[PDB]
Amino acid sequence: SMNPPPPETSNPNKPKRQTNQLQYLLRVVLKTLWKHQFAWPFQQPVDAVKLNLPDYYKIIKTPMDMGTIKKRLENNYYWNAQECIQDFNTMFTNCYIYNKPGDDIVLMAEALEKLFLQKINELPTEE
């Protein structure tokens, strides 16, 4: 079995812009979620081969993870904060679609999501 290519993190054709909100997403939001005790399953793309989940990429067609998000932030991939917020949302929603409501991995995602939303409440206004 095989994993798909990861989500795009480099594209010289895509216009880029640094914004105070993007800087906050890296320096506050991502950094805080990354250090959380439940972050580890989310720090890299799901390796469906290693985890013996052959159905994963049949069910999840818009994959996303914090490793990818970290690279997109550090390598200035984004034009705006909404693109980055959408990536986090995709990551959470994927987890909830693929797994069962009770599952440990779901409780971990929910903890991270609660935290994420608290941090998004302090998103600075655009300079």
Ligand SMILES: Cc1noc(C)c1-c1cc(O)cc([C@@H](O)c2cccnc2)c1
């Ligand atoms: C994220 C995500 N979304 O769907 C799946 C499935 C994962 C996932 C990713 C991993 O890297 C490891 C594990 C699994 O071994 C685990 C981790 C923690 C608790 N309970 C189970 C699950």
